[PDB]
Amino acid sequence: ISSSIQAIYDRLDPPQADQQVDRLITGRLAALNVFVSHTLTKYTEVRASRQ
Amino acid sequence: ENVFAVESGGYIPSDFAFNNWFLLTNTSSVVDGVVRSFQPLLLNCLWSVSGLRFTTGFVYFNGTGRGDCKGFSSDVLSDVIRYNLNFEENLRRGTILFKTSYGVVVFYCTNNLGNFYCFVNTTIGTETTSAFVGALPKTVREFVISRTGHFYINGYRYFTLGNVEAVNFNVTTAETTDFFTVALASYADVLVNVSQTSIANIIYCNSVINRLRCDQLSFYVPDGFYSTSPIQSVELPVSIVSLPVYHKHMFIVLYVDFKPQSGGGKCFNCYPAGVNITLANFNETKGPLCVDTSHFTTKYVAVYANVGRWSASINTGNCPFSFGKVNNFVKFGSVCFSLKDIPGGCAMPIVANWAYSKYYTIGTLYVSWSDGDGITGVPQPVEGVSSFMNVTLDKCTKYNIYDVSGVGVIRVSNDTFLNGITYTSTSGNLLGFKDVTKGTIYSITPCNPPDQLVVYQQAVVGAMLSENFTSYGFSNVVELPKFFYASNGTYNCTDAVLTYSSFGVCADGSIIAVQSAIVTANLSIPSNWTISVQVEYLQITSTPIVVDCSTYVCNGNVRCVELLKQYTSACKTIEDALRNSARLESADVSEMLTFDKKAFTLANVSSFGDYNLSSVIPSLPTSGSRVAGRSAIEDILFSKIVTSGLGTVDADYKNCTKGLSIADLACAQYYNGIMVLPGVADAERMAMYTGSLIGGIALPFSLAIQARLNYVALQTDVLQENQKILAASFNKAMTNIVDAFTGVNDAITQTSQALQTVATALNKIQDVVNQQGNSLNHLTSQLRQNFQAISSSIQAIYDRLDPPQADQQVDRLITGRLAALNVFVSHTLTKYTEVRASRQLAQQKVNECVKSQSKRYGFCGNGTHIFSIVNAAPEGLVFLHTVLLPTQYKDVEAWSGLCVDGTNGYVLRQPNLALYKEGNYYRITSRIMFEPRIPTMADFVQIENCNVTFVNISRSELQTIVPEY
Amino acid sequence: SGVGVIRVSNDTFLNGITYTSTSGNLLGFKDVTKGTIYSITPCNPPDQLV
Amino acid sequence: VDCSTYVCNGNVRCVELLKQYTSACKTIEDALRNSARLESADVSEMLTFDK
Amino acid sequence: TVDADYKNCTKGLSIADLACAQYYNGIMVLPGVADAERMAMYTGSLIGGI
Amino acid sequence: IYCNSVINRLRCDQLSFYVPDGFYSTSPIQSVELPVSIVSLPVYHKHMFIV
Ligand SMILES: *[C@@H]1O[C@H](CO)[C@@H](O[C@@H]2O[C@H](CO)[C@@H](O[C@@H]3O[C@H](CO[C@H]4O[C@H](CO)[C@@H](O)[C@H](O[C@H]5O[C@H](CO)[C@@H](O)[C@H](O)[C@@H]5O)[C@@H]4O)[C@@H](O)[C@H](O[C@H]4O[C@H](CO)[C@@H](O)[C@H](O)[C@@H]4O[C@H]4O[C@H](CO)[C@@H](O)[C@H](O)[C@@H]4O)[C@@H]3O)[C@H](O)[C@H]2NC(C)=O)[C@H](O)[C@H]1NC(C)=O
Ligand SMILES: *[C@@H]1O[C@H](CO)[C@@H](O[C@@H]2O[C@H](CO)[C@@H](O[C@@H]3O[C@H](CO)[C@@H](O)[C@H](O)[C@@H]3O)[C@H](O)[C@H]2NC(C)=O)[C@H](O)[C@H]1NC(C)=O
Ligand SMILES: *[C@@H]1O[C@H](CO)[C@@H](O[C@@H]2O[C@H](CO)[C@@H](O)[C@H](O)[C@H]2NC(C)=O)[C@H](O)[C@H]1NC(C)=O
Ligand SMILES: *[C@@H]1O[C@H](CO)[C@@H](O[C@@H]2O[C@H](CO)[C@@H](O)[C@H](O)[C@H]2NC(C)=O)[C@H](O)[C@H]1NC(C)=O
Ligand SMILES: *[C@@H]1O[C@H](CO)[C@@H](O[C@@H]2O[C@H](CO)[C@@H](O)[C@H](O)[C@H]2NC(C)=O)[C@H](O)[C@H]1NC(C)=O
Ligand SMILES: *[C@@H]1O[C@H](CO)[C@@H](O)[C@H](O)[C@H]1NC(C)=O
Ligand SMILES: *[C@@H]1O[C@H](CO)[C@@H](O)[C@H](O)[C@H]1NC(C)=O
Ligand SMILES: *[C@@H]1O[C@H](CO)[C@@H](O)[C@H](O)[C@H]1NC(C)=O
Ligand SMILES: *[C@@H]1O[C@H](CO)[C@@H](O)[C@H](O)[C@H]1NC(C)=O
Ligand SMILES: *[C@@H]1O[C@H](CO)[C@@H](O)[C@H](O)[C@H]1NC(C)=O
Ligand SMILES: *[C@@H]1O[C@H](CO)[C@@H](O)[C@H](O)[C@H]1NC(C)=O
Ligand SMILES: *[C@@H]1O[C@H](CO)[C@@H](O)[C@H](O)[C@H]1NC(C)=O
Ligand SMILES: *[C@@H]1O[C@H](CO)[C@@H](O)[C@H](O)[C@H]1NC(C)=O
Ligand SMILES: *[C@@H]1O[C@H](CO)[C@@H](O)[C@H](O)[C@H]1NC(C)=O
Ligand SMILES: *[C@@H]1O[C@H](CO)[C@@H](O)[C@H](O)[C@H]1NC(C)=O
Ligand SMILES: *[C@@H]1O[C@H](CO)[C@@H](O)[C@H](O)[C@H]1NC(C)=O
Ligand SMILES: *[C@@H]1O[C@H](CO)[C@@H](O)[C@H](O)[C@H]1NC(C)=O
Ligand SMILES: *[C@@H]1O[C@H](CO)[C@@H](O)[C@H](O)[C@H]1NC(C)=O
């Protein structure tokens, strides 16, 4: 429904709200896992550059 | 008796066996694992009753009527009563009675198909509606009643009774030896270690450190820096801001009335009598009731009594909001309600239910809307043209500001901006807003932004804060260039146990920053030499993991596998990335682990005399089935480190379908298609490699070890005093580090240089084990997650649905589970790249330190190096380095210049060193050190002069300097 | 629900009626009337081919 | 990254729901922490001094 | 930004700059491992090596 | 090729006419139809047909 997680809880009964929020949790954990790959990649490239 | 005194505050003492106390469940009790849950394990009172006599009593969850409590007490409203039974007549006679808010309920069991069945006598008005409820589980050892009427027997919820005031349990006891304990308990938040489906040990997530254990599912937390946000204030003011608007106002009031059936002539639970429902002002001759006004409010009115176990409610049904919840500033372009169906609108069922066990849509509310705005739902009435702004400055607040909502601290701010009315980050969070009527700018700070905690030896030793006051109960704060730091630090330490960029933290939690032969001189030199053994660990490998992608994704379901084929090469690319990287680890480690039979037979205590290397040489093959076995320090190390509850890598598949017992983690993850390959570095091949490499120093053996001293010290250190006493000193140092691995022994500061390295090594090894466990846990646990489908159980989808519709549900699970694999592949490949660097460092450490004698400083221990020992460790090699250190540190004087035949003078161009004379010898050494090592040609230049600051010598006495001048 | 081989097993456990992995798969169950414990093995777990 | 704060924006109901994502945050944030510790070690080793 | 400084991010006297705004999202840039002082020290020593 | 033999199934499931030397995971094909087993807690068997 929204990116504003508080707005989901403002709108909905908790059983239905939690299944909306599971979409945001699953998305945001994927967004972190992408950023971790960017970060680790850059450290490996930089480790070669430092050597 | 096996019963205990409750600790003050209500906790269960950490040594307790949990002998017949069960982890409660609504379903699916875990076999082995670490789990975090709310459980009734915080105890408000506990006592026992014993079968010499019997007493019958009614115990109220408010604590009334309880027994004589042990160790501690509290008078709060309990959530649960636990009865724990020592004895064998179980529930097969006697009764349990519940004073329910409307009457007495009796539970009892009977066998009058020779086994026992259980029945509940709900009694109302003195008519008894006796009901069956289940078979009795065979050996009742615990049963538990919640205040909300859940009844758990042996840790499973057999049924529910609805709210209870008081419980009585009534028994006649065959012996004086019979007893049961009783406990009144409250739901508390705990981390639990479960083995063979029984509680082994627990911790409570109450203290700052235990919360950091719980939130990482680990009983041990490795040293490091951990992010945490402190728990937020339990209830919050509300603040509201909006643009002024004409306050035309409306109430949507919904009234629900219904009656029970009664007297059994119409059966009390069977369908609601007397149902009446209305909206106010729903004159349906006008059509659906519509919100004409700018602000509206929703009210639900319960006209019915809560007679018996009857309840009623609105539910969201299929709407993107709930009735009631639309009062929270939800906005619409138009919204309308009806009790007759309306087109395109969702419907909210007006549900009555009895006992949460029979449910009736006594009506429904039909609701329809346009998105947009001009209609807002609000908590309470409003009037006129003027509109309030309601704000709670400087306190954490729940806000709805210009139709944006969240939680934070609202504060008036020094900025002025012409533009806009709300200000936001890239992430769309509110950062501030403008009071449009007044031109003031307010800023939003999230209350409890993340702090960061420094953990060292499983206490929080300090914290890093965005503000200048002592969170976490620390004593003092200091400013630093980019944050505040808070600690119980005395600022009187110099050795850092952790480092974080430019900053070192010492063991007190206190924080710090980190970084002559020319002269007739007085300089300070060790007249005695002492040796220390220093310990370092490098990971050599990680146990390769290969996943059968088809089995992981589809759980073996045949329809799923046919659908998975459409994901062209998706499995192929995942599983081949894991296979290729496993093949490279196997090649590299197998290349590294050499052997040499000659050196291996020499690698023995017989070959070392005074030097008690007995603890580090590989053991004889007492089994005969091997060339070698683990050393004493290897067995201590492998046994001292707890294999993770989150996922094993010591897998063995040859029992996983013989099936004589319920699967351990190794088989349980193999069922999910995850295979740990056999370790590339077998304990035999490690003992062979390591033994050969220790034997490489025997290639007279103590005299060769003494020759390694001679690179520091020629003349003195071959004297029997040094030969014997340095060997005795080595044996003492070895005795200290083998004790330190064997068990916790306190380090004084002098031993702490060595003993901190042992503590550092064990924390690094336990961290490697725990990271491997977590990586594997995150993969297996994702199978439990349903990716916006009906269920994670792929067979259940096919049980429910026609194949065309089922396959589109399953595509959600396939897409999710292929993403979960792709994440695990990145974890795995990352760890192999980190380990490849660690392995490369380790094999050059083997060359320089272990085989050679390293000429570097600080590369093998903080001290002057003589030799190294290696041993196996978890996924690892561990190193012992032996190093020589100043003692009896005092003046030994040093000379600029030497005067030759009393007539010619010698001046020296070797500033890296110090030059000194003793016992008819002259010796040149690093500026503060006691190396009896001789000077050389072209260190000295010669002049037709002498000075009184020189020493005096003939051209034959020059032989003490060199034979060459 | 699922597919697998159900087998009577040597274990005894007091707790629960169903037993599960971290992945939420059934690993076994208890016949509540009789106190026997049964274990579930998935038929055709992955082998590996050279 | 504080994975809990990134995913849930500090909302308390969300954090209780996020606990069900067993070790998902733990593996993200420990990968970032371990790699940060290695960068700090390597650069701190490289940047010598001689008065 | 990566030139972060957290010691103003809750004093709150002005609306957050990017450094605080991303810290609100739980993203922390650690202090640079190579401080301008430690760089000047390393570099100076290494130029002095001639 | 026809995905009938053990090796040809391993070719087909990798979309390759050539399979490189190595170790390949496979689960053998399952029995074509299955008995049904049912377990449930005892309950009062009041019964109805929706025809
Ligand atoms: C099998 O399934 C059943 C359901 O079929 C599960 O039953 C539920 O279990 C959960 C816990 O897992 C229960 O929640 C806890 O209930 C405690 C008692 O709550 C009742 O009384 C309080 C007032 O005393 C009411 O507020 C509750 O709810 C009502 O009020 C809210 C207000 O928002 C309404 O929304 C509801 O509609 C109700 O009208 C209940 O009537 C309660 O104390 C407990 O609170 C702690 O935990 C929450 C988070 O879960 C914290 O926010 C809160 O701050 C409390 O924790 C802190 O406070 C304690 C105080 O001593 C301190 O020690 C610490 O500081 C601590 O951090 C929580 O709400 C739920 O009520 C229950 N439902 C039913 C219907 O029974 C079973 O548990 C499950 N079994 C297993 C084994 O999994
Ligand atoms: C979680 O709970 C289980 C069960 O208590 C713990 O496993 C047990 O751990 C103990 C040591 O804490 C092991 O005991 C040792 O076993 C060896 C080998 O038999 C023996 O030589 C030692 O003298 C000692 O007895 C025990 O074997 C092990 N039991 C099982 C069934 O695994 C586990 O360690 C707990 N985890 C945590 C983090 O608390
Ligand atoms: C616990 O709840 C019980 C039941 O409501 C309370 O006991 C009753 O209290 C009323 C008012 O004093 C009396 O009329 C009843 O006769 C009491 N019954 C019994 C058996 O005592 C009790 O007072 C409550 N206790 C606490 C600590 O709140
Ligand atoms: C629970 O209620 C049932 C039904 O009222 C009780 O069983 C009846 O008890 C009376 C008196 O002994 C007998 O006349 C009936 O023939 C019984 N009916 C059946 C079906 O057995 C039962 O005794 C109550 N449970 C108790 C008191 O433990
Ligand atoms: C830092 O010092 C403070 C005292 O200045 C310690 O505070 C105690 O904490 C324990 C555990 O919560 C309490 O039982 C005590 O009552 C507290 N004492 C006071 C005076 O507040 C704190 O534990 C110390 N922390 C560390 C890690 O050293
Ligand atoms: C208590 O249990 C005994 C079992 O012998 C039974 O005879 C008695 O009627 C019970 N009394 C109550 C009040 O449940
Ligand atoms: C119930 O079990 C007891 C146990 O000895 C037995 O004596 C009695 O006959 C049984 N009653 C029945 C089957 O009705
Ligand atoms: C239904 O309930 C409402 C609210 O109490 C009331 O106005 C109305 O008279 C009741 N009866 C009918 C037939 O609507
Ligand atoms: C602000 O909201 C609170 C919440 O109860 C209320 O008590 C107070 O009257 C409100 N102030 C104004 C100006 O409406
Ligand atoms: C505060 O506001 C005034 C006027 O906007 C400005 O001169 C001053 O520099 C500001 N100081 C800070 C710290 O924002
Ligand atoms: C921070 O706290 C300390 C100790 O109370 C105090 O001396 C100092 O003035 C405070 N302010 C700053 C900016 O350091
Ligand atoms: C502070 O450290 C110095 C040097 O180690 C020591 O002499 C002194 O005793 C220490 N003081 C305390 C009490 O920590
Ligand atoms: C060590 O050497 C001695 C003889 O030098 C020999 O008797 C003994 O068996 C050897 N021990 C081992 C385990 O190699
Ligand atoms: C070597 O040290 C170990 C320490 O446990 C001891 O058991 C052994 O007897 C010692 N052997 C010699 C030759 O000193
Ligand atoms: C495998 O089963 C056999 C049965 O003979 C047993 O002896 C062995 O200990 C079991 N091993 C494991 C790791 O389950
Ligand atoms: C190295 O050892 C010396 C002498 O024990 C000690 O003063 C110094 O602080 C140590 N430095 C490190 C980095 O361990
Ligand atoms: C089989 O069960 C009995 C009793 O539970 C136990 O003594 C025995 O050790 C078990 N053996 C195995 C291999 O599970
Ligand atoms: C932080 O606030 C202080 C207020 O005294 C100000 O002097 C300083 O310039 C600010 N620094 C940053 C980076 O915001």
Author numbering:
A (entry chain B): 858 to 908
B (entry chain A): 37 to 148, 163 to 565, 575 to 758, 768 to 1033
C (entry chain C): 455 to 504
D (entry chain B): 606 to 656
E (entry chain B): 707 to 756
F (entry chain C): 253 to 303
Please share excerpts from the published article on this structure.
The coronavirus S-protein is responsible for both host receptor binding and fusion of the viral and host cell membranes. Its ectodomain is composed of the N-terminal S1 region that harbors the receptor binding domain (RBD) and the C-terminal S2 region that mediates membrane fusion. To address these questions and to gain further insight into how the 229E S-protein mediates membrane fusion, we determined the X-ray crystal structures of three additional RBD (Classes III, IV and V) complexes with hAPN, as well as the cryo-EM structure of the ectodomain of the S-protein trimer. We find that an invariant set of core interactions defines the interaction with hAPN across all the RBD classes characterized.
To provide further insight into how the 229E S-protein mediates receptor binding and ultimately membrane fusion, we determined the structure of its ectodomain by single-particle cryo-EM analysis. To facilitate expression and structure determination, the ectodomain (residues 17–1113) was produced as a fusion protein with a C-terminal fibritin foldon trimerization motif. Since refinement with C1 symmetry did not reveal particle classes lacking three-fold symmetry, C3 symmetry was imposed in the final cryo-EM map and during 3D refinement. This led to a final map with a resolution of 3.1 Å. This leads to the exposure of a significant proportion of the CH, HR1821-852 and UH surfaces to solvent, an outcome undoubtedly facilitated by the hydrophilic interfaces between them.
